């Protein structure tokens, strides 16, 4: 896709799509067990989970199907483990005590958060505002660490162990171009 | 590809190929069999959805009868049609990106094709419609530029494929562009039978690469995102060893 | 001498800025082929001068060093003028193709500049042939996919859309949409993208 | 090095001092009276697009027809100023194609003392470029615009791309 | 079999909304339903034939307008399909000629909306507005200057009049309207300014009729003692051929028979031109058209006898186009002050009623040949005010109230203006009936110092100037807006230059061929001339 310079990096909507093409857990409100009825018979996802589904039990579906069922009354999304106060507390403690290493977080960081806060509001066991503020604090400190680490721009390589998709995407056009210019200067000088 | 484990594996391969193509600074070969399977799958899916829609429409409009039960009726069809729409969008974006890249490097590819010594041929890298696109576009652009300017241009330099003098008109791809990579490791579940990877302290198997210009050696461990130039990483990319982000 | 040529190149840059700030194919400027043909006539004068200079050089009266240095200077002049002209034309063709591909290859004479008369006739026939190529391309093995469709990923299935222009009633699959002026529809996303691109709908 | 690149073809038109190291009768016909030949060691301001090649052809003692003098743009004064404080220096006054011209010059002449000073230059300015790009309004003082009007022509695309990327990220995040 | 629309809707919708086409209306669905009804059979199980018929529908409908809606006309495209499973030529007058303006700064012709089509026209819409007479000479000068500048020789440069004020003792080249000022001296007018001329030592280019009101190229020395431009030579601007004139605007549909342009967009076509040229190359001898002399009178017995002798010869072999030109009444028609005898209008009506009787005995010519009538100097509308003298050039056609029997006797009659344009398959023809030799001879400008050369000079001047009436507003008043009809731009292939004061001739020059029919009767002999479209002429007479 040309659109001027949109052929080099990913737009945020593409990032949202690529993140929402991931598995998630679900608690169905209905039952579709076969009589021992139309077959789902999809092509890019296992049907045996959807067809052989009974109410009030745990099963794994893709995120977009979960959202589609959540639009009606046919769903109840289970929040992940890392979206709770007692996990984010130890996480933020880990960033504070370690001033050089990015903490381990899923690469869908901030994105599953945005989607779940926008859509799945009434299923959380914790207040929404507190979790939003703690996520904001996490983003703040990770931004500080990235800004501090950006000062070293070698012409050889660089290492960024635990950056999420959005953080890499919003920084690619600057770091890439600066390092390319440095490489060009060095190569033309030899 | 030679056989399918599951259509979802084909979907994953297509997505990985699209991601690799979008950020790569060089035109990559063409996975014919993957889309050969995918288009046929789309054909059957569309045929079956149309057949079932016709069946319900005829049942509903033959007489009053019983209207279709809302349960297990709307949701499956909605899911199939939206999945088909998303897959079509992904294919469309991939094809458009390849078309843009082929538009950019037309003259360089054409010059490379006529070389007999080059082991790479235009047939492998392109689909037939892309070959026809390149041929027609090059011919029409050459005719336009010849009718506009080159007819008044001196014969000694009327050729647009000149590679002599001060500046060359051939646009080679930039192999030294910096790209963001994620070390995927070996695609196999064992991920330890590869004859290239080595070990460091605390295990952590790594891949060792060297920079001919800078005379260095860089360790690439599994599970870390790096920022490395593209020329030294072509083989690892083509072996599904590392994935660009 | 090639300083005239510079006035072209700088102008082209402004056009690029028009392409950059808008981020939309719209109101492409009106050509500058007058200066181009001025450069063509002066470079024809240069070429004929080179031919006569070669004539005296072959005659034997002219000095070899003078002939060679004048030949190099004139060759550089032709090279730079050609470079400027092709730099102009490549950007023109790029913006032409960019606006041509996205409107389904119809050039939308019903609605973008109206008469597209600011283009040269050669550029106009190039546009027509490119539209022909785009129509031909999706008639092959990709007949089941509309290449000229939207590229925003499909995020929602049911959206609210508001009508912008009045029309009659339009047939759809198993239904009909009567475009009463200034009304709101709660319809499928995959049914009104063509109308939205045409500009007949609003408020996605 | 791109033939169809507009910035490069613009930058090729800059003027550099030169010397006619070798006398050629009948020249200068495009600058003064055609019948008057140009004598030895006569200085002009020739553009780069002919100075690059005319000083390398030689022609023939295969000395070149022209000799290229050290331009005032690359002078001890500018090097001292750039080494003292690069963040507050406005290169836009010296030139608008400074970086591309410097790359061309260092490719023509191998000088291991310009690459490191220029590298430290753009490395130091990149941090403030990022700082200004990350500052999105929610209109501003004189400092940011004063810096933005000091930028080089080649830095504008980096600044714009960073600004658009950050703006898109904020637009997607807050809905 | 009467179908159910719901079970047909998807088949049409898919093809006309996903692969190609868009926005199918309900009437489009009904038209497709009746089309399926006609081609009924093993349908809803027959794939290829229905979809290829739909593709043929697309190939029929995409050329018309833009094809984004289908109204009641669906039956019309169905009939187009049915009929897709001499003609192609038109005759147009100066009233319905398409209007195209001109702009100097962009150097393109610009379409102008027609007041007849978009305006009301209920009371008075034919009246031009005030600025048209201001802009008409500007447009003529702009076209002449562009033609001069496109010449191969001129790439020397001309200078505006106003820039002659500050310099002296230097030679210059200029061009402008050569005419008389208010004082009574000859002057040159330019959009910038005007100066005085000098003629006492002027050497002209022979073969040109130097008449006031024609653009002339002037060479001489300026003097600031007075305001005298001492001329040393005068020459008319040269001409250009049809192909080079066209190629600057591609192949514009000015006289568009295949398609027309409008304010929304501009059109072009050259693919069918060679097809039509080759079509013309065959069966051209059968498609012959014959023209007669001027000033044919429908009152005297001798002219009727000669016409009967011509018609008895022409009945057996009817031509394609028969053109009647000249004044049909030997006396101008005007107000009648006598109530004792036959009124002039009634006599004029009676003059044509006899022609309806004379056409009753020539059913072959009436049945196989079309009629063309062209007004002369003293027909009903002109001589009503000009009383037989010269007047406005865009003359109205013969009024319908005086030709109520010719249109019923003959199946093909057309009344045109004094300048008329017919568009053949690959030919365009202009017919212009008036006197030129005397007009140019009497007003020839004097310079202080075998009959075939006069027509040579006439043709050379009329083709170099590139305008039908190279005279000022004092001599021949012109309608303000219709002047574009008189402009000689994309010059026609053949000119029917009828003149009663010049001998018959068949000259051709600069890619244009000119024919000069004389009077229908002369020295007790009757003469009429037929032109073969293969650049061959014939002249025949019957005593």
Curated annotation (Swiss-Prot), chain B:
Gene Ontology process terms (BP): DNA-templated DNA replication; double-strand break repair via break-induced replication
Keywords for this protein: DNA replication, Nucleus
Superkingdom as given in the UniProt entry: Eukaryota
Result of changing residue 101 to E: In sld5-2; temperature-sensitive mutant. Defective in DNA replication
Example of a GO cellular component annotation carried by this entry: DNA replication preinitiation complex
Location of this chain's protein in the cell: Nucleus
The family this protein is said to belong to: Belongs to the GINS4/SLD5 family.
Known function: Required for DNA replication. Functions as part of the GINS complex which plays an essential role in the initiation of DNA replication by binding to DNA replication origins and facilitating the assembly of the DNA replication machinery.
Subunit structure: Component of the GINS complex which is a heterotetramer composed of SLD5, PSF1, PSF2 and PSF3. Interacts with PSF2.
Name of this chain's protein: DNA replication complex GINS protein SLD5
Native organism taxonomy: Eukaryota, Fungi, Dikarya, Ascomycota, Saccharomycotina
Section of the entire sequence shown: 50 to 294 of 294
From Swiss-Prot, chain C:
Gene Ontology cellular-component annotations: CMG complex; DNA replication preinitiation complex; GINS complex; nuclear replication fork; nucleus
One GO biological process term: double-strand break repair via break-induced replication
Subcellular location: Nucleus
Main localization (coarse): nucleus
Record keyword DNA damage present: no
Pfam families from the UniProt entry: PSF1_C (PF24997), Sld5 (PF05916)
UniProt keyword terms in alphabetical order: Cell cycle, DNA replication, Nucleus
Function: Required for DNA replication. Functions as part of the GINS complex which plays an essential role in the initiation of DNA replication by binding to DNA replication origins and facilitating the assembly of the DNA replication machinery. Required for the chromatin binding of CDC45.
Note: Present with 1431 molecules/cell in log phase SD medium.
PANTHER family: DNA REPLICATION COMPLEX GINS PROTEIN PSF1, PARTNER OF SLD5
Name assigned to this protein: DNA replication complex GINS protein PSF1
Organism expressing this protein natively: Saccharomyces cerevisiae (strain ATCC 204508 / S288c) (Baker's yeast)
From Swiss-Prot, chain D:
Biological process annotations from GO: DNA-templated DNA replication; double-strand break repair via break-induced replication; mitotic DNA replication initiation
Pfam family, one: Sld5
Localization: Nucleus
Gene Ontology CC annotation, any one: GINS complex
Annotated keywords: DNA replication, Nucleus
Role, per record: Functions as part of the GINS complex which plays an essential role in the initiation of DNA replication by binding to DNA replication origins and facilitating the assembly of the DNA replication machinery.
Subunit structure: Component of the GINS complex which is a heterotetramer of SLD5, PSF1, PSF2 and PSF3.
Family: Belongs to the GINS3/PSF3 family.
Miscellaneous notes: Present with 2205 molecules/cell in log phase SD medium.
The protein, known as: DNA replication complex GINS protein PSF3
Organism of origin: Saccharomyces cerevisiae (strain ATCC 204508 / S288c) (Baker's yeast)
Lineage of the species this protein comes from: Eukaryota, Fungi, Dikarya, Ascomycota, Saccharomycotina
UniProtKB/Swiss-Prot annotation, chain E:
Main location, first listed in the record: cytoplasm
GO cellular component: cytoplasm; epsilon DNA polymerase complex; nuclear replication fork; nucleus
Pfam families from the UniProt entry: DNA_pol_E_B
An MF annotation (GO) of this entry: DNA binding
One of the protein's GO biological processes: error-prone translesion synthesis
UniProt PTM comment: Phosphorylated in a cell cycle dependent manner during late G1 phase. Phosphorylation may facilitate the interaction with POL2 or the activity of DNA polymerase II. Phosphorylation is independent of DNA replication but dependent upon CDC28 in vivo.
InterPro entries: DNA_pol_a/d/e_bsu (IPR007185), POLE2 (IPR016266)
Compartments, as annotated in UniProt: Cytoplasm; Nucleus
Residues where Phosphoserine is found: 469
Keywords: Cell cycle, Cytoplasm, DNA replication, DNA-binding, Nucleus, Phosphoprotein
Highest taxon of the lineage: Eukaryota
Additional notes on this entry: Present with 3110 +/- 251 molecules/cell in log phase SD medium. In eukaryotes there are five DNA polymerases: alpha, beta, gamma, delta, and epsilon which are responsible for different reactions of DNA synthesis.
Family the UniProt entry places it in: Belongs to the DNA polymerase epsilon subunit B family.
Subunit structure: DNA polymerase epsilon is a heterotetramer consisting of POL2, DPB2, DPB3 and DPB4.
PANTHER family: DNA POLYMERASE EPSILON SUBUNIT 2, DNA POLYMERASE EPSILON SUBUNIT B
Name under which the protein is recorded: DNA polymerase epsilon subunit B
UniProt source species: Saccharomyces cerevisiae (strain ATCC 204508 / S288c)
Lineage, top ranks: Eukaryota, Fungi, Dikarya, Ascomycota, Saccharomycotina
